[PDB]
Structure 1
């Protein structure tokens, strides 16, 4: 597995941040090395989603950030990233056995030449 120029806690923070962003926005632009780590971490969260159990919900809730995605309106209740992972995202991969992400190569970034990719669901 990749050390991403970070300590163990920083890296675990970075993978939690990127994972949540990928679940919330369904498409993010990041570096190639970051995108090749995320695909593992996000496809495991989507698997827990599809599981759907309380146990599975609590495994995902131990990793996914507590970000409000949107506020829907029923008395307007906010929807958290974790609810969007079990209510919206996972069930749309119910008959797909793995491979919920795809990395498109975009090109190098002006400031540091970093190879940039779009990583997206489906």
Structure 2
């Protein structure tokens, strides 16, 4: 049965996509954001592909990721605001990085991850 496994995640696909997005969005907002270990890791993979279309740069692409984040402010905000800033590298526009501590009650190890300038 289980072992050889790809795209590894938690909670529930709907919950997840939910987050991936919400977050992708908030980061887009702040360039850099704070959450937990893989929150970042995978969020990287994702907000990741998004910036990918951000770059894509075109009526269509736009149409798509918008499909996913829903809201102009950012829509354009990214697509033109920074999408250029990046359009030229080889992806990996994500910088996921391990902070100094762990949230309370538990010691959940966290970090900041952002668009890698």
Q: TM-score, normalised by structure 1?
A: 0.82
RMSD between aligned residues: 1.4
Return the offset for 1:2.
Answer: 2.7
What residue number does 2:25 align with?
Answer: 20
1:46 aligns with 2:40: no
What residue number does 2:77 align with?
Answer: 84
Q: Where does the alignment leave 5 or more consecutive residues of structure 2 unmatched?
A: 1-6
Q: TM-score, normalised by structure 2?
A: 0.85
Q: Where does the alignment leave 5 or more consecutive residues of structure 1 unmatched?
A: 67-78
What residue number does 1:57 align with?
Answer: 62
Deviation string 1:58-107 (CA, Å, 9 cap, x unpaired) is: 111011143xxxxxxxxxxxx61111111112100122111211112112
Structure (1 or 2) with the greater helix fraction: 2
Aligned residues, how many?
109
Write the distance in 2 (CA, Å) between the matches of 1:103 and 1:37: 9
